[PDB]
């Protein structure tokens, strides 16, 4: 049980460190750090597998009405060197009319 | 002017005996300013006021705060007897004896303030 | 995309004073200490919640064991009555 | 038949044994009395039935 | 096993158990603990919450 | 005697009729700083004084009014802020008070604990490998 | 049961007792006194047994200072309690008379022989102090709070 | 509530207020056992012993076979707590009363009401155990 | 110093006595204030001997 | 502490007419001042210059059992602005000023004091506030002020008497509307000094129920006063107004 064990039965076992001749390579990854690494990789691969399923089973004739108010991801040919697959969003700025810029420049 | 005046038949001496008991128990504040500060801090359980005071307006000003805080007050007829009962070697005209959560004096306090509430 | 040119609404911005910058820095420091304190309190409460759920699961295991024992005692008494 | 609800109340705690005699006051309007089986009588006032 | 300096004396253990169970009581109910101080009324010193009803609904 | 009337025909309430007309909050940036300070007043007195945990989603109430304690006539020697301490906002009083170094110390401990292993650590590991 | 554990812990904390054996000891003598009071209430009023035995019981409790001198009925003798008995103990009387700073300080003083009850020093903290003997609790003459030698750590320091 | 130190009710000091249920009352008349005398002999203290109108209602709703227990309940020297609710259900009446005020000793004998009032901290349960009464969760007795 | 605060406390005591005497009378008097002013004057003479 | 000159903000409470002024390290309770620019008994008050005449006055819970009950957390206090309040036990008019500041100019507070010098202080503060009328009479005999008190909505009862339930029963039989709110402040050491306070409170609640009230809330206002309770009850109904 738990009362049938001495304090030397309860005593913790220490963890060894990376050798000092090899400490420049980083920390010695043990089971806990390996579990963190494996959890992050399995999570990222699960998201990527779901994205690959969604890109495979895509209707080529789909029509949402946000397509008339968004700029598409395009291709590398149409966009150019600045091509990421992400749809570009708006930063909030807008082209500003001349009367309001006349007001702002009088204030400045 | 002192309408809750204590009468003779073994109520003044019960009051002064409880006063001496509380003064031994260190649960008692002496003098007009200390009675006033104890009533305004609300720790007071009962307050004894002398009635033989040269001009009585001092032990007339204390009952207003006692009636505002609703604590019992009672006049004993001798400030010399009140000082002798406290153990002061001076004449005391106002005595307020406080409350504590654990004592055996509080039974005397409770019976005394029942008699005083019947006196009022 | 992080904008690289400086717009006119960024060029015309007023340089803020010293007292308002001291108030801004104080508000930054207070909001960070508040966020760290809230995260610590939530971690402690989640630890207490998981300990409570462990002990609740142990109590439910004991309840299922006593329920099975009382069920078998009752049906052992009734199976002799229908025999 | 829906609003036929005839029970209104009960005078006090009642008696200990059963009520074997009772009599109203024919001059007043709220004076009742009732004498029980253990020989105790009670005078009730109908305005305060508590 | 190794036991505590508190556990070697049965009075001091029951002193520290009462000090911490009187401390756990203030976190549930409200103790009186003296009225207004000598300084007066410095406000309700730890918050006032408006949408909290703490009365025993009879 | 009897005159031609003036014809005066051309949402949420402005003033509360039941609370003696508290005006609606003019949500200035100073009042917003004051309300953030009031929801973080547990952090301000750093553990010396804990507060009732009132945590709604919006800390700004609908009706407020920024006032000033005038005077208790019984206490006026130490229960009275001096001229060099009567400040404009509440955040200015918190900053003029002490333990701003205590806030900075706790902030730098939090900053070390949050920069503990994120990316400068990995840049240092990569440099020590490449050397 | 949790009610018994919390009640006995309140007694052991509020009066600086050592264990629950002292609580059970007081509860046993209180139950004996209260059983005698119930047996005397069984009889009718103005029976000579109830009259003289109840007067003996009430005079005994008033003389040992538990029952108050105001209330002297056998119903209040039934309404007696263990908080009143532990209040009549000596250790809480030293704490309430203020010779000691806390109840554990009072137990420490009574153990190492500083206070005296009347004439003789008292080594036991559960000494049931009577009402007549309540006033004569003070520091003994051989104690450094009473007089005589300045004491032990004082002697080692003044050498 | 005030006077509650961690499931220890400090509000109950003698004279003990004891609520009586119909099961306890029928069984204490059935066991040839005097009610106030046996309660005082159980607690060694002066009881005042109360019966709600739901309890009197259930004793009256039981037939004329229980007329003796009805007269025993209708003894005059006991307090009658009038109830202001609808159903005349003694269990919920007793539990609501005890949950509000919590100064009472509940005297029952049914295990359903006993398990229902064991959940709330600091109420003793008095039950007749064929020779005398027995008080369950009172620490002073 | 100390004598200034001592005279301040004594003056506060006698001013409290004078305030309650002048207040709680119906139509007040003069001679009790005269007595207390003589007492303050003889104390002003008393502190000079030292 | 809550020093003079600190900036606080003043938000409404859950109750009507009461506000809570919070700021910095101390949140306190206040009511809108009826006569602005003057304190009654030397209390701290709160001036806000609206974008002058607006002032709030701080409500001491250690001095007034109503503010102690509000900070304890009563479900309602029955006194909205414009509701008549009969105050019994209006000793010197300290909390009566805050009740009058709650009920505002269109309400009325009938403050009954028995002693005469407390009556002088009450007549002074009711000279200041024109909606509190002072009645120097014994609250045990409500036939004296039946010309003065019309049928009020709320009764406050802060009398420390052993016959407190009978006093409130006859005063509410004479001057309280059908379904009338009241708050009674029970002090156990003055009701029954020997008995435990929870038993004293249950006995006083039972006496009110015999005197035809229906009790709906009860709190022991413990961090402000020892062995005190505040019982809220409705006269002759179960709901408050109708
Ligand atoms: Zn019922």
Swiss-Prot record, chain A:
Give UniProt keywords alphabetically: Nucleus, Ribonucleoprotein, Ribosome biogenesis, rRNA processing
Query: Which GO CC annotations does the UniProt entry carry?
Result: nucleolus; small-subunit processome
Q: Transmembrane among the record's keywords?
A: no
Q: Where is this region: Disordered?
A: 1-24
User: Where can this protein be found?
Assistant: Nucleus, Nucleolus
Compositional bias, Basic and acidic residues, is annotated for 15-24
Q: Which GO terms describe its biological process?
A: rRNA processing
Question: Which family is it part of?
Answer: Belongs to the UTP11 family.
What function does this protein fulfil?
Involved in nucleolar processing of pre-18S ribosomal RNA.
Q: How does it assemble?
A: Component of the ribosomal small subunit (SSU) processome composed of at least 40 protein subunits and snoRNA U3. Interacts with snoRNA U3.
Q: What's the protein called, per UniProt?
A: U3 small nucleolar RNA-associated protein 11
Species for this entry: Chaetomium thermophilum (strain DSM 1495 / CBS 144.50 / IMI 039719) (Thermochaetoides thermophila)
Gene this protein is translated from: UTP11
């Amino acid at each position: 049980m738990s009362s049938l064990r001495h304090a030397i039965q309860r005593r913790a076992h220490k963890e060894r460190a990376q050798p000092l001749e090899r400490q420049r390579l980083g920390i010695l990854e043990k089971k806990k750090d390996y579990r963190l690494r494996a959890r992050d990789y399995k999570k990222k691969q699960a998201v990527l597998k779901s994205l690959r399923q969604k890109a495979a089973e895509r209707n080529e004739d789909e029509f949402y009405f946000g397509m008339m108010s968004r700029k598409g991801p395009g291709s590398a040919l149409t966009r150019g060197k600045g091509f990421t697959g992400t749809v570009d969003g708006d930063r909030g700025n807008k082209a500003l009319s001349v009367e309001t810029v006349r007001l702002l420049k009088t204030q400045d | 002017a002192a309408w809750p005046k204590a009468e003779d038949p073994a109520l003044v001496q019960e009051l002064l005996d409880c006063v001496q008991q509380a003064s031994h128990y260190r649960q008692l504040k002496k003098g007009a300013n200390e009675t006033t500060k104890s009533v305004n801090r609300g720790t007071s359980e009962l307050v004894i006021l002398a009635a033989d005071t040269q001009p009585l307006s001092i032990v007339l000003h204390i009952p207003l705060i006692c009636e505002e805080k609703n604590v019992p007050y009672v006049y004993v007829p001798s400030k010399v007897a009140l000082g002798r009962a406290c153990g002061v070697s001076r004449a005391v005209i106002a005595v307020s004896l406080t409350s504590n959560e654990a004592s055996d004096l509080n039974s005397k306090i409770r019976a005394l303030r029942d008699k005083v509430e019947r006196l009022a | 995309k992080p904008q690289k040119k400086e717009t006119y609404m960024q060029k015309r911005a007023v340089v803020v004073g010293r007292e308002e910058r001291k108030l801004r820095d104080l508000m930054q420091k207070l909001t960070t200490i508040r966020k760290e304190k809230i995260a610590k309190r939530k971690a402690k409460k989640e630890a207490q919640r998981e300990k409570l759920k462990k002990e609740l699961a142990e109590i439910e295991e004991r309840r299922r064991e006593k329920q099975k024992k009382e069920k078998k005692e009752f049906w052992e008494r009734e199976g002799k009555k229908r025999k | 038949r829906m609003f036929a609800k005839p029970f209104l109340g009960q005078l006090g705690n009642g008696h200990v044994q059963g009520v074997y005699s009772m009599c109203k006051d024919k001059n007043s309007l709220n004076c009742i009395a009732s004498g029980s089986g253990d020989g105790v009588v009670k005078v009730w006032d109908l305005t305060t039935r508590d | 096993p190794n036991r505590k300096k508190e556990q070697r004396n049965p009075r001091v253990k029951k002193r520290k158990k009462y000090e911490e169970k009187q401390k756990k009581l203030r976190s549930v109910k409200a103790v009186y603990k003296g009225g207004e101080g000598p300084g007066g009324y410095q406000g309700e010193l730890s918050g006032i919450k408006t949408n909290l009803v703490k009365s025993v609904k009879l | 005697e009897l005159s031609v009337r003036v014809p005066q025909l051309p949402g949420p309430p402005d003033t509360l009729s039941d609370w003696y007309n508290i005006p609606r909050t003019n949500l200035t940036p100073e009042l917003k700083r004051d309300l953030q300070l009031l929801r973080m007043r547990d952090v301000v007195a750093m553990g010396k004084q804990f507060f009732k945990k009132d945590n709604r989603k919006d800390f700004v109430p609908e009706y407020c009014q920024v006032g000033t304690i005038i005077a208790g006539a019984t206490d006026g020697v130490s229960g009275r802020l001096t001229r060099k301490e009567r400040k404009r906002t509440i955040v200015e009083e918190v900053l003029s008070s002490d333990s701003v170094s205590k806030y900075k110390r706790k902030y730098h401990e939090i900053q070390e604990h949050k920069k503990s292993g994120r990316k400068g650590y990995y840049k240092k590991l990569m440099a020590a490998r490449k050397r | 049961e949790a009610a018994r554990l919390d009640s006995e812990l309140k007694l052991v904390g509020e009066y600086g007792l050592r264990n629950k054996r002292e609580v059970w000891r007081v509860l046993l003598t209180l139950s004996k006194i209260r059983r005698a009071a119930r047996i005397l209430l069984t009889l009718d009023e103005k029976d000579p047994k109830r009259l003289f035995e109840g007067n003996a019981l009430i005079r005994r409790l008033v003389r040992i200072g538990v029952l108050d001198e105001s209330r002297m009925k056998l119903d209040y003798v039934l309404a007696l309690k263990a908080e009143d008995f532990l209040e009549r103990r000596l250790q809480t009387l030293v704490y309430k008379l203020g010779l000691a700073k806390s109840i554990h300080h009072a137990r420490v003083l009574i153990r190492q022989r500083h206070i005296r009850v009347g004439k003789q020093i008292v080594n036991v903290p559960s000494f049931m102090v009577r009402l007549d003997s309540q006033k004569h609790i003070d520091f003994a003459l051989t104690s450094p709070f009473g007089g005589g030698r300045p004491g032990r750590v004082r002697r080692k320091k003044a050498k | 509530p005030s006077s509650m130190f961690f499931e220890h009710n400090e509000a109950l000091v003698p004279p003990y207020n004891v609520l009586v249920d119909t099961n306890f009352l029928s069984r204490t008349v059935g066991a040839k056992l005097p009610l106030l005398e046996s309660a005082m002999d159980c607690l060694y203290a002066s009881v005042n012993i109360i019966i709600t109108s739901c309890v009197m209602a259930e004793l009256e709703k039981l037939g004329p076979r229980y007329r003796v227990a009805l007269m025993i309940a209708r003894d005059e020297r006991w307090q009658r707590l009038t109830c202001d609710h609808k159903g005349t259900y003694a269990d919920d009446c007793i539990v609501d009363r005890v949950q509000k005020h919590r100064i009472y000793i509940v005297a029952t004998n049914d295990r359903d009401l006993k398990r229902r009032i064991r959940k709330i901290p600091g109420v003793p349960i008095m039950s007749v155990q064929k020779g005398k009464y027995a008080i369950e969760r009172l620490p002073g007795a | 110093p100390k004598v200034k605060g001592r005279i301040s406390r004594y003056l506060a005591n006698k001013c409290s006595i004078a305030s309650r005497i002048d207040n709680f009378s119906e139509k007040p008097t003069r001679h009790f204030g005269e007595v207390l002013r003589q007492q303050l004057e003889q104390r002003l003479e008393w502190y000079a001997k030292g | 502490g809550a020093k003079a000159g600190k900036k606080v903000i003043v938000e409404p409470h859950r109750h009507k007419g009461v506000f809570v002024a919070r700021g910095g390290k101390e949140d306190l309770l206040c009511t809108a001042n009826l006569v602005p620019g003057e304190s009654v008994y030397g209390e701290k008050r709160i001036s806000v210059e609206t974008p002058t005449k607006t002032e709030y006055r701080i409500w001491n819970p250690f001095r007034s059992k109503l503010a102690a009950g509000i900070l304890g957390g009563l479900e309602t206090i029955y006194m909205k602005p414009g509701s008549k309040v009969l105050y019994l036990g209006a000793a010197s008019g300290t909390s009566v000023s805050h009740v009058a500041d709650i009920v505002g100019p269109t309400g009325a507070v009938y403050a009954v004091e028995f002693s005469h010098r407390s009556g002088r202080d009450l007549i002074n503060m009711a000279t200041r506030r024109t909606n509190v009328i002072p009645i120097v009479e014994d609250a045990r005999k409500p036939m004296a002020y039946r010309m003065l008190v019309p049928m009020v909505d709320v009764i406050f009862a802060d009398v420390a008497q052993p016959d407190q339930a009978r006093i409130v029963g006859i005063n509410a039989r004479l001057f309280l509307k059908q379904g009338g709110g009241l708050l009674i402040s029970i002090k156990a050491s003055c009701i029954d000094s020997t008995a435990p306070p929870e038993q004293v409170f249950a006995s006083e609640v039972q006496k009110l129920r015999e005197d035809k009230f229906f009790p709906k809330e009860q709190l022991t206002l413990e961090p402000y006063e020892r062995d005190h309770a505040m019982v809220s009850c409705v006269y002759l109904q179960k709901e408050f107004e109708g």
